[PDB]
Curated annotation (Swiss-Prot):
Its EC number is 6.3.2.9. GO terms for molecular function: ATP binding; identical protein binding; UDP-N-acetylmuramoylalanine-D-glutamate ligase activity. This is UDP-N-acetylmuramoylalanine--D-glutamate ligase. The keyword Lipoprotein does not apply.
Length: 432
C-alpha cells in the first residue's frame, strides 16, 4: 500500500505503536502518535521529530487523520476512536499494515490457551527445516518488525483485539486452538473467527466447537483432537502415538514435553506446519528437540537420565492438573507443590498421585494442605530450595523433577517467574 502524503495517527506508545512509527518513517511518512498514559513506555524511544501527545487522546489529531492505526487492547473501545469511525475515518491495526505488505506465506494462530507454545513450536519446525522464518505477533515481537524481503514464512500469534482491526489476512494456515472464558464471549469469538477468512487451510480443534468456522467445517478444514480427528492421540499396548490421517507418526516418548495438552499443542503445530508446506521430517524432529517456553513445562536440565521441568506458570489447580494428565515418567515423579493456594480445592489432583512412582515435596504457606493429598509419600519443607535439596540425593535415571506447584508464588517470591528461575538455578547446581 502507498501511504505517501497521508496524515497518519498512531494510538499507543507501547512496542506495537513504536513499530508503526518505524514502519511509516521507513516509507517517508511522519506520523503523529498519542497515548492515554502520561508517560508510556515508548515515549523515550521516539524520534524527536515525531509529534506526540500523552495523557489523553487528542481528538483534533484523530479527526484530521487520513488513517488511524490503533494499538490492540481495551483502548480500541475508546469513544474518540468510535467518533472517528462514525465519521468514516479508516481505522486499522499493525497486523493489517503487515498483511498488506507481506511477501511470504503467513501461519496465523489464535486461541485462549497454548497460543504462545504452538506459535513457538511452529517456528521451531520451520527453523529445523532451514526456513528463514519470522515468528511474532506477541506483545514482545511486533509483526511489523519481522517484515523482510528475505523472509520465507511468517508465523503470527494473534489476539482478538488484533483481529478486530485486520481485514487483509489471507493465511496459508490458520487456527483457533480453543475458546474459553475482558468483554463478552460473543465479541471475543467473532474476532477470532476472522482468522479463517481467506485462509487456505483451517486447522480446527475437534473437541471445541467454538473453533469451527462460522459456517462450519468445509473442504479447507483439518482437525486435531484427543481421541479423534485428522491429528489425534493413539494409546495402545501401553504407549502413546501421534497419529495423522490414520498413521502413527511419532511415539510421544521421543518428545521432551508431556502431558495431554502439550500433546495436543504438538498435534496442532504439526497440522499447521504440514499445511504450510514444511517438511514432515523436520517438523517431527523439532517435536523431539523442543524444550518449552520459560516456566511452561520448560526442560531446564536433562542429565544422568533425570529431567528437571520448570512449570512454575502453573499457579492454580487446573494448570497442574493439565501437567499431570497424560504425564509420562519412566521412573519416579518428584513433584514440587506449594505456595499460596488461594484457598483452592486441591482434590482434583488426587487421582494423579497414586502409584509407587510418585513422591511429593510440599513447601510454602499452604504446604501442609498439599502434603495432605497423600501424606505417606509426602515431605514438607519451608522453602522450595529445601525441598529440592531433600530430593536431589534420591533421584535416579528415569526420574522427573517437576515444579508444577498449583499455587501462587507471592508468599515467598516476587512472581512465578522468579520462582521458576530459582528452580532452574538450583536444578543446575544439584543435578549436574
Amino acid at each position: 500500500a502507498d501511504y505517501q502524503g497521508k496524515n497518519v495517527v498512531i494510538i499507543g506508545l507501547g512496542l506495537t505503536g513504536l513499530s508503526c512509527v518505524d514502519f511509516f518513517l521507513a516509507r517517508g511518512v511522519t506520523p503523529r502518535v498519542m497515548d492515554t498514559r502520561m508517560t508510556p513506555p515508548g515515549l523515550d524511544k521516539l524520534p524527536e521529530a515525531v509529534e506526540r501527545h500523552t495523557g489523553s487522546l487528542n481528538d483534533e489529531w484523530l479527526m484530521a487523520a487520513d488513517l488511524i492505526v490503533a494499538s490492540p487492547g481495551i483502548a480500541l473501545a475508546h469513544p474518540s476512536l468510535s467518533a472517528a469511525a462514525d465519521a468514516g475515518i479508516e481505522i486499522v491495526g499493525d497486523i493489517e499494515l503487515f498483511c498488506r505488505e507481506a511477501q511470504a506465506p503467513i501461519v496465523a494462530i489464535t486461541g485462549s490457551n497454548g497460543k504462545s507454545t504452538v506459535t513457538t513450536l511452529v517456528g521451531e519446525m520451520a527453523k529445523a527445516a532451514g526456513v528463514n522464518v519470522g515468528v511474532g505477533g506477541n506483545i514482545g515481537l511486533p509483526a511489523l518488525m519481522l517484515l523482510d524481503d528475505e523472509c520465507e514464512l511468517y508465523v503470527l500469534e494473534l489476539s482478538s483485539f488484533q483481529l478486530e482491526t485486520t481485514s487483509s489476512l489471507q493465511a496459508v494456515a490458520a487456527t483457533i486452538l480453543n475458546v474459553t472464558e475482558p468483554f463478552g464471549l460473543q465479541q471475543y469469538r467473532a474476532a477470532k473467527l476472522r482468522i479463517y477468512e481467506n485462509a487456505k487451510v483451517c486447522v480446527v480443534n475437534a473437541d471445541d466447537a467454538l473453533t469451527m468456522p462460522i459456517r462450519g467445517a468445509d473442504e479447507r478444514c483439518v482437525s486435531f483432537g484427543v481421541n479423534m480427528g485428522d491429528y489425534h492421540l493413539n494409546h495402545q499396548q501401553g504407549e502413546t502415538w501421534l497419529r495423522v490421517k490414520g498413521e502413527k507418526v511419532l511415539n510421544v516418548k521421543e518428545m521432551k514435553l508431556s502431558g495431554q495438552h502439550n500433546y495436543t499443542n504438538a498435534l496442532a503445530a504439526l497440522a499447521l506446519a504440514d499445511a504450510a508446506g514444511l517438511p514432515r521430517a523436520s517438523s517431527l524432529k523439532a517435536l523431539t528437540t523442543f524444550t518449552g517456553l520459560p516456566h511452561r513445562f520448560e526442560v531446564v536440565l536433562e542429565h544422568n537420565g533425570v529431567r528437571w521441568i520448570n512449570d512454575s506458570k502453573a499457579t492454580n489447580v487446573g494448570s497442574t492438573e493439565a501437567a499431570l494428565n497424560g504425564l509420562h515418567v519412566d521412573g519416579t515423579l518428584h513433584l514440587l507443590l506449594g505456595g499460596d493456594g488461594k484457598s483452592a480445592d486441591f482434590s482434583p489432583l488426587a487421582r494423579y498421585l497414586n502409584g509407587d512412582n510418585v513422591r511429593l515435596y510440599c513447601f510454602g504457606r499452604d504446604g501442609a494442605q498439599l502434603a495432605a493429598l497423600r501424606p505417606e509419600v509426602a515431605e514438607q519443607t519451608e522453602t522450595m530450595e529445601q525441598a529440592m535439596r531433600l530430593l536431589a540425593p534420591r533421584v535416579q535415571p528415569g526420574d522427573m523433577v517437576l515444579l508444577s506447584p498449583a499455587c501462587a508464588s507471592l508468599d515467598q517470591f516476587k512472581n512465578f517467574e522468579q520462582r521458576g528461575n530459582e528452580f532452574a538455578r538450583l536444578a543446575k547446581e544439584l543435578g549436574g
